[PDB]
Design a protein around this ligand. Structure first.
Ligand SMILES: *[C@@H]1O[C@H](CO)[C@@H](O[C@@H]2O[C@H](CO)[C@@H](O)[C@H](O)[C@H]2NC(C)=O)[C@H](O)[C@H]1NC(C)=O
Ligand SMILES: *[C@@H]1O[C@H](CO)[C@@H](O[C@@H]2O[C@H](CO)[C@@H](O)[C@H](O)[C@H]2NC(C)=O)[C@H](O)[C@H]1NC(C)=O
Ligand SMILES: *[C@@H]1O[C@H](CO)[C@@H](O)[C@H](O)[C@H]1NC(C)=O
Lengths: 48, 48
């Protein structure tokens, strides 16, 4: 149901965050791309 | 005109940002240092 990022030698899922991913390009030129949400922890801090 | 940071084996320029850099010392003990401006995306996030 959810998506996580983990290492390739031990199972240790983490929730997707901007600190864990690297952004580049557009959503057209990648085969097999899947859609989900990339979170941002700074928004609650800014709103508070 | 502009200064970028890129990898060594494939030309892919990224905009100079405080996330890509690392701070140490002052501007007197490095030969060939160059004046420029290091941007910061935190200010628009915390202001706008
Ligand atoms: C993104 O998720 C959606 C929903 O599953 C997929 O469907 C398309 O999404 C884009 C933008 O998210 C829309 O512009 C299209 O109209 C959607 N097509 C539909 C609903 O048939 C999409 O495949 C996912 N991936 C991308 C890259 O959009
Ligand atoms: C470019 O960098 C040099 C050295 O970092 C600057 O030279 C110094 O500038 C300060 C004030 O900006 C002065 O107080 C010093 O006397 C200057 N020293 C020398 C040896 O010139 C220079 O001003 C910088 N230029 C710009 C446009 O920022
Ligand atoms: C390269 O050599 C020139 C000599 O004309 C000098 O002015 C310049 O500072 C040198 N650049 C570096 C990075 O040392």
């Amino acid at each position: 149901t959810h998506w996580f990022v983990t290492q390739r030698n031990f199972y240790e899922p983490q929730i997707i965050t901007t600190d864990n991913t690297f952004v580049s390009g557009d959503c057209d030129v990648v085969i097999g791309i899947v859609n989900n949400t990339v979170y941002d922890p700074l928004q609650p801090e800014l709103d508070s």
